[PDB]
Write a protein that binds this ligand. Structure first.
Ligand SMILES: [Mg+2]
Ligand SMILES: [Mg+2]
Ligand SMILES: [Mg+2]
Ligand SMILES: [Mg+2]
Ligand SMILES: [Mg+2]
Ligand SMILES: [Mg+2]
Ligand SMILES: [Mg+2]
Ligand SMILES: [Mg+2]
Lengths: 427, 427, 427, 427
């Protein structure tokens, strides 16, 4: 007795893959019965993972494109949604630099503990849930969906296929909507715009993508799976065993045993085609934001997979006005969307906004003390016309929500917070 | 047979208390032998807590005053130090709101797990230590002390005197320089600029301050101990047992058994005088920024304790161009300093800089996409003249430092990170 | 536009309260509308919390009684379930001593971080899920329900009603089936069998029980709520404000402001009746294991609440053969069940089993080296006839399950773990 | 202007390397100035790591041999020291299976987050420090050194040389005395007695051991570095690039690009010799417990390095009486010690002691209820003559130590724990 969490049958899963348009052109090299064999006798429901992934998939098909900014704190995601954005990007670079479970500042080389990104996903969802709870008790209808989908960095999976599986499962438990996975050797992982990258064989990354899909299937959620290739700049590969990689092997070896390979858009197109049956979106890391190179990649991939959606990193590692003029910057995302780049994001937006704004404030305070803080406060007061609410800082973090819990439990409590506050009297 | 970490003798501890000027006018109601009894057979050295506390104490006597801004991420603290600040303030409000170990957004009511602030202390010290490491390999000498002392919020101690002891011990293990403790009931704790606060008896907060000094003594570091009183606004107190509180008890008693009490500056002055023998700095929570009230509080405390240093929260819970003209705003901290307010801080500075800068960026991104980010990138480029370094983000999170480790281990490595990067090629 | 996780209407909730026999004689002093107001626009499903609470409630009515042992690691809980037990008890004492998030060894005085017990609940559920997954791939049907319900220690809620609310919420997220709450002052919390206990007013504990029910309702799960009274040995109380508490107040007060109160079974009976409308189970902490005293308490409460179910701590803080003979010990739990004690548990069973087994092994090892280990290994081999499986330690921690994942992703993998193992070769 | 934590000069470090016998026959391929360059301007003192490493090294020379049992909780370590052991072994296998930061049960394949073993190091040290504090206030001198050295599992580094560096640094911050490192591919890590192990080239493990020594030098502590080789059973290697590995390459390759290689004692001996200049102890993982195979390994290494100390895993993965008689079992460790195996350990002792004791208790409890627990409590009472103390569980976890803290803060407090307890009244 008790049927809570009973797993679906293999036939139900198979019928869903056979008939739901979500799974059009999605290859699974394992079976529905393989999935059920791994589920035990109770499947935990992952509400935020399910809802986020369904919302993301529909926005990728209903909006001209979905764009996002890198968030590394929960308040930062709340402001992104308040300001109108409809998805959140969770950067692994930013987690390494300023939000991972070791407590350390790291460059983007897979140095932090592998459950760090799941913990930030959970944090972001907690923060959006609080904003949603506050808005409900305030009757604030100005944001349609506080639970914007989160797209998170799975890096190179922190090891083998089993590490990929466990990371994807942990991201789902935390409520992620989509995750991306790149074809680098995890032990030598680099930021796509850092040097010295080592690729893994094409088939090994297909194994990674298959493992990420399997973890989503076993968890019963339709997570958006994104394949990333680092072959534009990488000049090293671990092995020449894969026949699709051999055209680019030069035969030269390094002291460590790696193989030198010829980099460029050509191996990226070849890998993207190989990954397409296994990814919902395909992403080419690139050293410069270049509309023409984007079109060449876009058109080469859609020659084979006309419906394949693409993702694009508008990266802060680029110096945007020493390779482009203002008119191209202003149309950049709109043109990319027309080539099929349906998910576009600024990875390190949060790092730069956080670091610049604290430097600016702290430098003024160093010279002029309170005059510098009053400047920022006036800018916040101004931003209230645009919908900024964090000026009322007590309600922003839920003081009114917890007052409501308190008076629900005890309508006659003499210790409520907002009653008799300096926010109630000066703001 | 090793002697590493052997504890000092009671006689050496006592000499220290008797002759070191650091302990002039510090009351310890326990004995030096009581400290040794609690130390087991090994005392861990706490390098950063020791150095931070020593630097903080010297700064409070050598500078006209020490000021700080609330920091809630490691990168924030690094930019405050890069911008010239000589201390870091760690707000519990900000930890409740955006950085605690529950992962939830909370109002400032002691809801988060008790080891959350120590974890942020440790993170900030990790971040400063990386900034210091990078500066050394780069030959950067533009900041004399990267390891700025950290003053952290101990709230109401999260329980009784034993919870206070464990919190102080964890803050020291993490490297804090100073900590502050308030005379609020922990189970009903509220932001000073919140309403309906409940005070504890004067002697009970003396027990808290004594427990905080004991933990520092048992840890063998000279932590700066700050006493905060919440009596200006609180109209409730847990008990009338203490004869020093009785002049303000009305005799009315609420449904929960709290006693109503007369608030204002007179109970604050009484409590500050009771706390002075047990605190290195004294802090009155205040309901508006007001030079004349601060003057009255200062002169009343210094009539009985001329050497007592005071602390002042310049709080963001206030509207500054509301009350004050620009000239008062511009002189506010200097004026407070001449009155003995030697530690001054903006508690929620990190909350406001973070939330406003991301709202501002996301709002522009939602309308103009890349044009909004370029505006931010160009302000960052412009700030480089004032010393901002985070534009080169790979270097900023230590890619150059970890390249140095890699080539120390293997000088012939072909997988180092800065060579070939877009940061070398475009910045 | 997604409907995933849409909250129910107040109308629906009200009807469930009015018609589900689960809620017979459960008093809620708030409204269905109050619950819906707190739920935001998405309610996360809590599968393990729902299933466990449901299974627990059914067992409490279908079995003669439910008994459990304290578990402080996931492996301990797996062995309890393997051995036949149908519930798991999660001791806060055991968490304080050996399994809390500060990493410190503490006595049972609410010293550890308030999210420690939720993390162990999550751990235990993870461990039982792994045993469930392993059982499925091995075709083992000897255990009917691997996901045994977990009853966890809420202590005194770590502060006020809002701290209770957050702890119950975190327990439910982690998958708990029931939680217990005691009428002690959190800042002076003690193990029930320690001295120096301080009660809070009867009505304050009703507020605690109400806050815990409210969190369960807002989380949409029928969590079992257990009230515990410490009035048998406590001689202090925070306040004489509650008229139900005044008959035991002696008039004498302490320097902290506490009131002496007359302890024993009589205030226990009175508090149990006051708590009965707000608790699914009622528990009296007692000073000795005594059937006569258990009968007096049971008869007194059931004289007013004939159907009220009770809980009993068979405590290791008792010296058992100093109070009872072998016959009484053998009948103890069965006699208790006939008096209405439907949940019985040995709180510190894991602490004693863990400490004794390791002392015994280590002592023999210090003397006879490998001969002592072989003794343990042969007892292990012998216990396999009773159903013990941990002697094959690789499959016990999921080597076979993760092998199945690996071959599902890539059936031709040459790096699977159990083929070639010494376990396959020697066991 | 503080001197706390000032780094040593290069000349000072070099003089230590040249003249301290600790460093006789220790190769460092980097310079003293390289160490200094990585230290920033403050070196944190790591008291427990320094003391533990110094105690361990002395014991390895003074005792006939050092032996230990695997510990996965702090209380297990306490009992091992109370029983007379002088080192603690911290098994990664046990951390995977029941004590890692993901909360999941895992097989031994480097699946858990990379900071998990450091957290358990820190937990064990906290547990031993508390036992040391309790012993000091109880006047108990029966155990000479409560802070027994911890030897912890660094597995395969969780990635590359920078991951190794950060793990060693985290283990040292937690207080480890020694750490061991194995020549397996981290992404395909197995337990030494699982199948499907992949080796890395000899020079790559030298890189690992160099990185581990580098982190200890930068941390300014003499950590014991242990090299483990898995070449006895592994039939795969990532690359044939290293001429020392080529004699064992067969030529053929797997689908994934691995090279088949000839396993056995012969490649272990060659690897042990290559590692010896970089390891304080050397360890070959074996398939069966075999004194003459151990002699062969020992003689072979010492033919080139007569002073090289060896370590030996007395593994539970062996069925002991399916290989040896009782006389050989009885003399096994003594015989190994005479061959130079100075560190000997039972890796999974804590796993088996924990799982067996809780299975046995729960099994009796399910059938006989209190009868089963009283049998355990009686064995505990009878063990007090051998020195067992945990029967008095309140004092065991520090209730008397925290009472002393409480009475140091307030000697007249009315809320101390041990007076009035059932422990004082029944034990
Ligand atoms: Mg990344
Ligand atoms: Mg596709
Ligand atoms: Mg605060
Ligand atoms: Mg003073
Ligand atoms: Mg308890
Ligand atoms: Mg009831
Ligand atoms: Mg291991
Ligand atoms: Mg050597």
């Amino acid at each position: 007795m008790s049927v809570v969490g009973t797993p679906k049958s293999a036939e139900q899963i198979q019928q869903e893959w056979d008939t739901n348009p979500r799974w059009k052109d999605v290859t699974r090299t394992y079976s529905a019965e393989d999935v059920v064999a791994l589920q035990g006798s109770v499947v935990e429901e992952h509400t935020l993972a399910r809802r986020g992934a369904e919302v993301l998939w529909e926005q990728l098909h209903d909006l001209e494109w979905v764009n996002a900014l890198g968030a590394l704190t929960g308040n930062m995601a709340v402001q992104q949604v308040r300001a109108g954005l409809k998805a959140i990007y969770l950067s692994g670079w930013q987690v390494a630099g300023d939000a991972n479970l070791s407590g350390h500042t790291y460059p983007d080389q897979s140095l932090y503990p592998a459950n760090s990104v799941p913990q930030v996903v959970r944090r972001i969802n907690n923060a959006l849930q609080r904003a949603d709870q506050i808005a409900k008790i305030e009757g604030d209808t100005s944001v349609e969906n506080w639970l914007a989908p989160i797209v998170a960095d799975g890096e190179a999976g922190f090891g083998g296929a089993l590490n990929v599986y466990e990371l994807q499962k942990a991201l789902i438990a935390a409520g992620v909507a989509g995750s991306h996975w790149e074809d680098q050797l995890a032990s030598e992982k680099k930021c796509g715009h850092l040097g010295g990258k080592v690729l893994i064989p094409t088939q090994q990354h297909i194994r990674t993508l298959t493992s990420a899909r399997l973890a989503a299937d076993v968890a019963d959620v339709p997570t958006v799976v994104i394949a990333r290739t680092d072959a534009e700049a990488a000049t090293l590969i671990t092995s020449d065993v894969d026949e699709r990689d051999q055209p680019f092997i030069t035969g030269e070896r390094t002291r460590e045993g790696f193989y030198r390979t010829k980099n460029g858009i050509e191996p990226c197109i070849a890998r993207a085609k190989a990954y397409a049956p296994f990814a919902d979106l395909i992403w080419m890391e690139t050293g410069t934001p270049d509309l023409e190179a984007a079109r060449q990649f876009s058109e080469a991939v859609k020659a084979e997979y006309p419906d394949q959606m693409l993702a694009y990193n508008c990266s802060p590692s680029f110096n945007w006005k020493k390779h482009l003029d203002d008119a191209t910057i202003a149309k950049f995302q709109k043109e990319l969307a027309a080539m099929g780049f349906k998910f576009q994001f600024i990875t390190l937006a949060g790092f730069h906004a956080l670091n610049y704004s604290m430097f600016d404030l702290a430098y003024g305070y160093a010279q002029n003390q309170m005059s510098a803080y009053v400047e920022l406060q006036e800018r916040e007061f101004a931003a209230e016309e645009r919908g900024y609410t964090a000026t009322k800082h007590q309600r922003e973090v839920g003081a009114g929500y917890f007052d409501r819990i308190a008076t629900t439990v005890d309508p006659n409590s003499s210790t409520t917070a907002l009653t008799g506050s300096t926010e109630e009297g000066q703001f």
